[PDB]
Structures are given as C-alpha cells and as structure tokens.
From a paper:
The native ribonucleoprotein ([name]) particles are formed by the association of these single-stranded RNAs to multiple monomers of [name] (NP) and a single copy of the polymerase, a heterotrimer composed by the PB1, PB2 and PA subunits. Such RNPs are independent molecular machines responsible for transcription and replication of each virus gene. To better understand how these processes take place we have determined the three-dimensional structure of a model ribonucleoprotein particle that only contains 248 nucleotides of virus RNA but is biologically active in vitro and in vivo. The structure shows a circular appearance and includes 9 [name] monomers, two of which are associated to the polymerase complex.
The three-dimensional reconstruction obtained by imposing 9-fold symmetry lacked information about the polymerase complex but could achieve better resolution for the NP ring. We also carried out a docking of the atomic structure of the NP in the cryo-EM reconstruction. The handedness of the cryo-EM map was determined on the basis of the correlation coefficient of the NP atomic structure docked into the symmetrised volume. A good fit is observed between the two domains described in the atomic structure and the volume of the NP monomer. However, additional masses are observed at the top and at the bottom of each NP monomer. We propose that the extra mass at the top of the NP monomer corresponds to the protein sequences not solved in the crystal structure while that at the bottom may contain genomic RNA. The interaction among NP monomers is conserved in the NP docking presented here, with the only need to alter the angle between NP monomers from about 120° in the crystal to 40° in the [name] volume. This interaction interface would be more realistic, as no NP trimeric structure has been described in natural virus RNPs, and would imply a small change in the arrangement of the connections between the loop and the body of the NP (positions 428–438 and 396–402). The model obtained is compatible with the interaction mode proposed earlier and further indicated that additional side-by-side interactions are now possible due to the tighter packing of the monomers (black arrow). The relevance of the 420–428 loop in the NP-NP interaction was verified functionally: The contacts of amino acid R416 and F412 are essential for replication, while amino acid K422 does not appear to be important, in spite of being conserved among type A and B viruses.
Numbering used by the authors: 21 to 72, 92 to 202, 213 to 396, 402 to 428, 438 to 489
Write the structure that this text describes.
Amino acid sequence: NATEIRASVGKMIDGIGRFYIQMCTELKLSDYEGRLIQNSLTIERMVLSAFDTGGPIYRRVDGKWRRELILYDKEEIRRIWRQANNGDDATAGLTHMMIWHSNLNDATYQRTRALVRTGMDPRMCSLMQGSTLPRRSGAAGAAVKGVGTMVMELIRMIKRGINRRTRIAYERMCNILKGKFQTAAQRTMVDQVRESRNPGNAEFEDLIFLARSALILRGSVAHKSCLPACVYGSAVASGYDFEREGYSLVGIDPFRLLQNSQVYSLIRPNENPAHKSQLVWMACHSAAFEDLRVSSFIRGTKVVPRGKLSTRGVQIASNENMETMESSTLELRSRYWAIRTRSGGNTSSGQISIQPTFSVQRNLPFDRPTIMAASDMRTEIIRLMESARPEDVSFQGRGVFELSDEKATSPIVPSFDMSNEGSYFF
C-alpha cells in the first residue's frame, strides 16, 4: 500500500519544504545563503523550540561571511509553520527534524560522559542510537532508538526513584525495549525485569546485562534517512511535489534526493572539506554506528573513522570568529543505496495428542513421554551469546542497489575481501 504511507509522508515532507522556503523569504536570504546547512539548522531549531526564539544566521558579503544573531516571535514561527502545513500541526514534521538533528548528533559526538555516569560501559556506543532525541519525539520517533538508548533512561528514571502515573511509562518503556529484542530469552527476560514496582539494583544490574546481549544478539532498530530542512525546501521549490509523487525515509527516495542537493557548509580554516561532507552524509542516513566497510562501500569513497576525522562540529560556536572562516560544497552523493533496515540479524495444561478430522496420509502426533510417563534466563542468553561468531553472515541474500534501480528489482552483493580501513566509526 503505496498510497497512505508513501504519499502521507510526502505531505509531511512538503510541509518542511514550503516552511523552509517561507522562512528563508523572511530572513531575506539568498539562494546560496539558503543552502547553507548552517542557516538551515538554526531555522530548524527555532521551530522545534517554539513548538516545545532566535539563533545564529550567517550572511554573505563581498568576500567574507557575516554571522547575525537574530530573534523571532516564538509564535510568529508557530504561525508560519502551520501556514505551510495547512494549519495542521504535523507533529511528524517537527519530529522529522527532531531526528535529523538526532542522527547528526549521534555521528558528530560520542556520549561517554553520560553512559558511565549512568553505569553503562562506554564501549556500548553502537546501542545509543537516539540518546539525544527528546522524549517529545513521536511513536515512530522512538522506533529509531537503540537498545542501549532505552536502558540509559529507565536506569535514570529508576536510579533517582529507587534512590504516580510514572508507572505506565516504565512498563511501556520496557515493552518497546522488549520489542527491540528478536529472540525468545531476550524477549522473556525483559518481562522478568518489568515485574518489579520498585525495581532496584536487581533490575539495574540485569538490564545492563541485556544491554550487552544486544552487542551480540542485536535487536530491531529502524533507521530513518532524515535530510536537513534546506534539502527539502530546495526540492519543494524545484517543483517536486512529494505528496503527489510519493517519498520514503528508508527507500531510494532519500538517496535520490541527495543526488542533486546543492548543500553548502561553513568550514573552519584547518578543516578538511572531504571530511566535512563525510560527517553530514553519515547523519543523513543514521550510519554513525554502521560498519565503516559497508558505509564506504555504498558511499563510493573512503568513510574515515571518527578519530581520523578532521572536524569538531558542523555548528559554529559564538567563540569563533568569522574573519578566518570560509565555506565548502558538501559532497552528499553516494555510489549505491540500500534498504535502511530495522532488523539486527540472527543465526503443561495443553494438548498431547491430535484427534483426526480428515482422511489423509498423516503421522498422527502424540507426546510419547508425558503420556506413558504414568533457571536463570541469563544462562539462556549467555549460551546463545557464545555460539555467535562475528563472522556470522546477516541479511542473507540482501544487497545494494544501483541508483538507477528505482524498483527494488536487482540486488548486488558486496564482497569485502579488500584493503579496508576499520569497522568501528568510534
């Protein structure tokens, strides 16, 4: 059903576009100045703030870039927003930029200070997908969250409490949690946790376990390709009428859109442009915890690790100066594309006999034992954990698609026998 899903999300994309265009028309920015991921960001945040203000706005004068510090009627912003969405709220829309920010933050920064202070191992990076993502995020906003993300929450919710309506949260927060797991025990052990009203260190210690189980027996976490407002604004302005032509966040749509985007970015004096583009590109698909090998494969070019990356962050701090500041054109094109997945990969009182109702060749079942016959769920997992090898192939048969292959017709299988450059962005 490509009607609602493909076109309703198109309508949410149109809103962001239209709005970005309106908002650019207010600031009286130029074309080059509306394509500046910097300014786009500021605008996006102005809005999410107002629906839950001012910001840094960079201008282009003969030669050099001028930063303007401006403020807007928090309500005016809310007004212009609905105007674009037909006077609707389009929470989806705000939530969308709510993620674009997330996915950018999960790649620009490493959130160790918080994991440890929670009592999670800093090496649990690949499980903190969407830790920055405000709770206000929607229902399809949390689905993007990593297993580890959920744990940091409950643990704090629990840690301060164990140190009214708050209950329905906890159970649900676990149900979601549990819905991340895709194996018997995993699933069952989550329940054993959700049993305690005042879950103390008993739970505190157990979920942390399950956190680590996901490092091996991963869960289902959705990835959403959420591009900057400018990209959608520019697209809308170019005629693309997504609600009519359909759009996706996990298909070929987002890559294709980025195949023509003209996004520019402010770049500090000693920073590497190629390195800058990489960053943004990884935020456009939630590839901050992906295997660098595959990221580079699909990317088309080296996807260098965070440490070796030359850049501190895309936003410009009030500290810096404009004199020594210039801007480059971000390389967001990719070689192939791939279905952004959700899956993490993987490798009595009852009846005892069957009463036959039809005449067919059928082995008739009965439980030989029970008839003639007259522990720690951790263990289960630890035992599963074990048989697991890092070489264990996932998404068997799934491949990569050419950018011409609009339909999911012909898949391509990558062979990594190659002089790679690592697998852990962090």
